[PDB]
Design a protein around this ligand. Sequence first.
Ligand SMILES: COc1ncnc(OC)c1C(=O)Nc1nc(C(F)(F)F)c(-c2ccnc(C(C)(C)C#N)c2)s1
Ligand SMILES: COc1ncnc(OC)c1C(=O)Nc1nc(C(F)(F)F)c(-c2ccnc(C(C)(C)C#N)c2)s1
Lengths: 71, 616
Amino acid sequence: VSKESERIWRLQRARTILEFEKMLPEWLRSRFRMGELCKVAEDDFRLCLRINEVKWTEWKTHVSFLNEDPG
Amino acid sequence: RLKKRIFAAVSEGCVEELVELLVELQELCRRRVPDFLMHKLTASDTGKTCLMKALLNINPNTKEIVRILLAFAEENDILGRFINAEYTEEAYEGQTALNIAIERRQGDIAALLIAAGADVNAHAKGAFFNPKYQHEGFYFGETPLALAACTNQPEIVQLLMEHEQTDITSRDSRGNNILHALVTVAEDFKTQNDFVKRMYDMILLRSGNWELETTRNNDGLTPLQLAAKMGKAEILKYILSREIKEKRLRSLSRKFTDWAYGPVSSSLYDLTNVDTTTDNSVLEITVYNTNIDNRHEMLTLEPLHTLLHMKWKKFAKHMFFLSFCFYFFYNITLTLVSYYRPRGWLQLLGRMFVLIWAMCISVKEGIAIFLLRPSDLQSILSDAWFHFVFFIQAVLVILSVFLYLFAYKEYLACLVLAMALGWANMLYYTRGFQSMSMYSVMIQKVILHDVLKFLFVYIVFLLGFGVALASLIEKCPNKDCSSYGSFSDAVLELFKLTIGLGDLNIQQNSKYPILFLFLLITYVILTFVLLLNMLIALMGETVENVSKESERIWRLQRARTILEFEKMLPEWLRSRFRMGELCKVAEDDFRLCLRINEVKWTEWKTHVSFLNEDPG
Ligand SMILES: COc1ncnc(OC)c1C(=O)Nc1nc(C(F)(F)F)c(-c2ccnc(C(C)(C)C#N)c2)s1
Ligand SMILES: COc1ncnc(OC)c1C(=O)Nc1nc(C(F)(F)F)c(-c2ccnc(C(C)(C)C#N)c2)s1
């Protein structure tokens, strides 16, 4: 029942987030506008969302990346 | 341009012959002294060279590419200033090609660079490698040895440690050496699978000497005190009980099993920077730091656990019982002067007792509050909170005596409040005994968490339905025509409807009686649902969680009480108690060891080692 209450809270939270995003005008929505514009290919330039993670298990040489200088 | 051409030729890696041709052309242009060559081989803005740019972009043909690059550098007497070129940007300042070859987990190329003269003592002192927040930057110790250790590369660590020019005892920007950095980097077992403990053991044995463990960073913290400060419980458990059975590296041990026969084992733990006789030991740090929430797991490690147990048995049990007895008799006298109030032979003697003891309690708990750092008050079921209620009660007592000496009538409110709060504060002492600990923590959890939330929502219900049923009731010319008359009348009737002292059938006197009874039955149903909700939350959630949470809170309060009592004693008394006896460990070691005999009846192994084989 606590799973159920937490799940209901998360679902209604997402629902009211989307409700509130619909009330704003166009300019306020464009001023919030989640997502940074990023070039991912030769000429792609698609809006992305950045997520940092730390994994201490899958040790691999890093050969796929867009920037060679992290930060 | 040739710089961009060579850079792309060395980064793409699909063409090594193209960089060979460009290097032939570079030698041709150089035929026309070293500075022009390295200005055409390193990006002037950042400082990245063809070695860095080649190692950042790894491909199956990068070993031959770096061989070609180092050959061209050696054939020009420039290898020195080329293989040890570093960044210049304030983000990766000091990063070298060895750092880049180790972060890419390139063992062959790393051995190549070290055998070609790369300074293994380079310090990546840039804002990326010394960040302020994780996930933006990565702190490893600012050294290729620390980088190879922090990223689980035991073979590169062996290669760097078997080097002669390497420096294991080198301190980075923060003063952290390899061991402070390994402590800073350790996370958990469900996150790292416990390789930092293995790297710690390896780097400590290979450099067999106390210079790494006795080094203080820019905060004065050794690796052990640093593992205590940030709650690295696995690293701390490893260090605090670390037994080297090798005959030469046994002085690096902290626990010396010298006795084991069957399931029994009498070991000798080390108490050098542990047993509360130094500036800030592992015991005091482990007990007093409230920025981790891992103390429950760290106060169970063998030396700290037995040290707290023995401090208790020796003096703190008695000091706690005397504290409890004094507070109990102070509360009894406060009760007696509250009941027998004036409405001076021995009464004033007792009042002066409670007044001087209230002043003493007030100064004590006020001192404790002054040096009471935040993050202690993070949890409500924490001992730090009690200093506040003890202070408030002592303040109420002295304020009531002040108001009684003068001609005020409100001294009785303060006196009765002080008596009630003292009897409540006895809960601090019942949380110090063991059984009463579980009982009192369960009671206080119920109250402070669930009773207060339920009481907030229930006060909302009470006030709402009291206004609703009071506005529905017609004024009438002044004996009790109604029962839900004034607002306080309605709130009282609803409250004692909840606790079972109320009747649904009263003098109506209202003009909308069906709406009145609908609202009343709605109150009853909603408050039953709320009551049963709280009751279900209690009966389900706390049958398993607070069961152990009781032991957690008891252990924390016990440790904090033991340590403050030990601080209260005079220095000669502390010197008298001072658990732990001297023991010769090596040629000249002579450390204060604590003997702990542990019988584990689930033993399947054999023991052959000793310090005094003759069982004590
Ligand atoms: C709305 O329901 C609730 N919602 C949340 N919490 C609740 O309890 C606090 C309740 C509830 O009804 N509680 C109870 N009240 C009483 C009363 F004695 F007062 F009658 C209970 C009772 C009655 C008779 N014999 C016992 C013994 C001593 C055997 C036990 N045990 C207990 S039980
Ligand atoms: C007297 O017994 C009854 N007879 C007939 N109907 C009843 O229910 C309406 C009842 C009954 O239990 N009433 C109650 N009133 C209250 C009050 F909060 F208001 F004080 C209850 C209470 C008080 C304090 N902590 C709880 C916890 C959080 C432990 C729970 N759960 C519940 S319980």
